[PDB]
Amino acid sequence: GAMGSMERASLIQKAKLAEQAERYEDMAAFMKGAVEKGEELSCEERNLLSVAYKNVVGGQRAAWRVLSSIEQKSNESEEKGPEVREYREKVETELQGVCDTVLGLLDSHLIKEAGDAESRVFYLKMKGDYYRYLAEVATGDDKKRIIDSARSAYQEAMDISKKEMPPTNPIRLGLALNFSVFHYEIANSPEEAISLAKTTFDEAMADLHTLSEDSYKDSTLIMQLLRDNLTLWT
């Protein structure tokens, strides 16, 4: 790895600088280097890893959607040659490469060393998310296995979170939010998506009285996202 000669603490410092500079490809490379030092990640470090790759893959997903839409229209039309498909394929392969990189970091060896609920649920949720991004661009016979991998990671995260975290825990809430999106957008299960979002929202509502002002703000922010999706879906 190109970051093998840099100190772990320097990689973390530079990831934070890269975030401030909106240099998310750099930020992800720095955090990959930090993971590859072999030590577990703190809560703050896990969030830096997630922010970095979320921004990188988010740009790729947005670009892939633009190109896929142009490609689909081109097949409704004048033959413009292979270029739209070629370039959509190029972006798709790069996106798949980033997802494979993240999944590889989780498998070597973040998840296996994660024993606390907050770390294990965080990682997986991430594993579910990046298999979900792979599913968005997959087609038949590979899509089914990718979908099952996403489902399996989300389900293990859910099982741990329900046993080990309060229903207002922001990690638990964000996992439920994203698993519900998986059900709606990937798994063709809108009723499961709605049920999950509603039960998650209602059980968090009943636990808000236990929270400080700052925790209350953290939890209600994600509950609003659940509500926003329920509003769109029902």
């Binding site: 997903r61 998310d129 964000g174 939010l177 994203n178 999106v181 709606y184 957008e185 994600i222 996202l225």
Partner: peptide, 4 residues
């Protein structure tokens, strides 16, 4: 998108 509607995720976290």
């Amino acid at each position: 998108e509607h995720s976290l």
